[PDB]
């Protein structure tokens, strides 16, 4: 709404902020581990912007899903470790390569899958630091005085994912694998199976608080704050 | 909510702002390129520029309407500062669904979907 001129940045203007991520539910079932895509630093060749390469990789248990900032390698593409929250700033966010797993000949990756993603823009901010690619002169008339020094046009939005409801739940209901779209109609080759699940609708983080010193009055230094998260699964199968 | 008096801008009161555009999904299929519409400078008690509705072939890379209308911002907004930079020197086009549907042979629109 309001970001008037002039602007006098500092050398460290980072802030302690938080947000709630994009909401994502999905489940993939197959006899082959899933294939995910993410953007990383490639090799190529001008400007000092890092070259982007689309990488495919096997989605392993514990990999981070996209949170609204895209499916990219934040550890290599954001060197300052401060553009995204700490739980993804040194990790890689992967998105399922639905097209590749659907176009594979035998269809061993995706017997069946469901997905429900949603997000909207909650707030609008801009980045601090040198703008690597300046706005060309044909897109604005130069200013003067207080508006002599142009402000950073390196915008970035904050996601949110609106609301979670029981009516939109994908789980706790049976799926019947009658006829798959691929050529493999649910045959579990190798006597093994792969179930990929993402569920941000149960992402509540419990706050724990320990008392270091008991006193008659409240003091901040008398307590330690911890954050814990739990996940509960119960996989049920019917085989023929 | 609040915009009390007095108030009068200076000579340069522009601000560094951002926004999220109107959401638009659409797909048109045909054997002829689609025809789009946009408002441009046409040809007197007011100095307001005359508006004319232009038809043109929508080319790959043209900007869709973002909520500020389907117009030539480069020619109708001379200050280059009323809309964000990705459309301030571009022309936003909207598919002329009525024209493409009313053409005799119907080569433009075999089928289409839209959600704005």
């Amino acid at each position, epitope marked *: 709404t*309001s970001n008037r001129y*002039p602007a*006098q940045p500092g050398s460290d203007n980072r802030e302690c902020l938080s947000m709630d991520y994009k909401q994502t539910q999905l489940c993939l079932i197959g006899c082959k581990p899933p294939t995910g895509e993410h953007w990383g630093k490639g090799v190529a060749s001008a400007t000092d912007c890092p070259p982007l390469e689309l990488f495919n990789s096997i989605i392993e248990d514990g990999d981070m899903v996209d949170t609204g900032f895209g499916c990219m390698d934040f550890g290599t593409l954001q060197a300052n470790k401060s553009d995204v929250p700490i739980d993804i700033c040194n990790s890689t966010c992967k998105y399922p390569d639905y097209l590749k797993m659907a176009s594979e000949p035998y269809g061993d990756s995706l017997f069946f899958f469901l997905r429900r993603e949603q997000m909207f823009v909650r707030h609008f901010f801009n980045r601090a630091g040198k703008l690597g690619e300046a706005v060309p002169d044909d897109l604005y008339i130069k200013g*003067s*005085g*207080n508006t*002599a020094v142009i402000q950073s046009s390196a915008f970035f939005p904050t996601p949110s994912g609106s609301i979670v409801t029981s009516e939109s739940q994908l789980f706790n209901k049976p799926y019947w694998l009658q006829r798959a779209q691929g050529h493999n109609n649910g045959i579990c080759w190798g006597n093994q199976l792969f179930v990929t699940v993402v569920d941000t609708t149960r992402s509540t983080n419990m706050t724990l608080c320990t008392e270091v010193t008991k006193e008659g009055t409240y003091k901040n230094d008398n307590f330690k704050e911890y954050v814990r998260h739990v996940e509960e699964y119960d996989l049920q199968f019917v085989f023929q | 909510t609040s915009n009390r008096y*007095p*108030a*009068q801008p200076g000579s340069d009161n522009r601000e560094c702002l951002s926004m999220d555009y109107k959401q638009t999904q659409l797909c048109l299929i045909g054997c002829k390129p689609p025809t789009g519409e946009h408002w441009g400078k046409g040809v007197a008690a007011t100095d307001c520029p005359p508006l004319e509705l232009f038809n043109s072939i929508i080319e790959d890379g043209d900007m869709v309407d973002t909520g500020f209308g389907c117009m030539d911002f480069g020619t109708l907004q001379a200050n280059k500062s009323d809309v964000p930079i990705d459309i301030c020197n571009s022309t936003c086009k909207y598919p002329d669904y009525l024209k493409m549907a009313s053409e005799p042979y119907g080569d433009s629109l075999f089928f289409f979907l839209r959600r704005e």
Partner: antibody, heavy 120, light 107 residues
Framework: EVQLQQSGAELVRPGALVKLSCKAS????????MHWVKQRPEQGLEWIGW????????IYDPRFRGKASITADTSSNTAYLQLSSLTSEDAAVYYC?????????????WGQGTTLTVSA | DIQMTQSPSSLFASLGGKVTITCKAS??????IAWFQHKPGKGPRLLIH???TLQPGIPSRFSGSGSGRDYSFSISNLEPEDIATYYC????????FGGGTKLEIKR
């Protein structure tokens, strides 16, 4: 009736910290800019800085960026001027003043003044 | 960045006379100059903003003019309550006060 009451006669030994007050009455501090101006004895007026109390914006002259931590609390309708590591040169007369962005008339109202002397 | 050269540093004239102060800026300030009256023990009083716009309550005998880098400020029909120190000030880019001018009444 617009007023800008201001602290007066603060003497601190060199070199400690000092925080001057300036709370207004008759208008909201969140609405307008809060400026600070210095005046050394037998010298002219030197603009120190300005703060937007609505969001804590800070604008300083590059001379005073070092030892001028200016703040403002809208709840108390007050503006603060903090100076660290006071010297003999730092002793002067300080004023707070009101500015408006939507009606850019420079310095609408000035406080009565604060005299800062430094000795032991 | 922008400097303000105010001249002269002191003035003197009889009651009912006219005095003039000149301020030259180091660069164009786009007519965004103000003039203040500062009396000892008081706060500065804004007399003129935007080169030649008087504040409410300021007598018409105070006046200003100028453009670009050159500006002036005149006080006609001098009166005993005019004894003060007058400052010019550019507010085109941040703020920069002039050196000041000590006015005295000649008797």
């Amino acid at each position: 009736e617009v007023q800008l009451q201001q602290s007066g006669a603060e003497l601190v030994r060199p070199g400690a910290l000092v925080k001057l007050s300036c709370k207004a009455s008759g208008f909201n501090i969140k609405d307008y800019y809060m400026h600070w101006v210095k005046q050394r004895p037998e010298q002219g007026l030197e603009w120190i800085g300005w703060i937007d109390p609505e969001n804590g914006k800070t604008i300083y002259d590059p001379r005073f960026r070092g030892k001028a931590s200016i703040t403002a609390d809208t709840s108390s309708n007050t503006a603060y001027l903090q100076l660290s590591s006071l010297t003999s040169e730092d002793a002067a007369v300080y004023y707070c003043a009101t500015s408006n962005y939507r009606y850019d008339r420079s310095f609408d109202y000035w406080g009565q003044g604060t005299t800062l002397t430094v000795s032991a | 960045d922008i400097q303000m050269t105010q001249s002269p540093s002191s003035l003197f004239a009889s009651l009912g006379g006219k005095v003039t102060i000149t301020c030259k800026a180091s660069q164009d300030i786009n007519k965004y100059i103000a003039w203040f009256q500062h009396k000892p023990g008081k706060g500065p009083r804004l007399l003129i903003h935007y080169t030649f716009t008087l504040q409410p309550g300021i007598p018409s005998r105070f006046s200003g003019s100028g453009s670009g880098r050159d500006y002036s400020f005149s006080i006609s029909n001098l009166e005993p309550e005019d004894i003060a120190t007058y400052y010019c000030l550019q507010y085109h880019n941040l703020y920069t006060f002039g050196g000041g001018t000590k006015l005295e009444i000649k008797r």
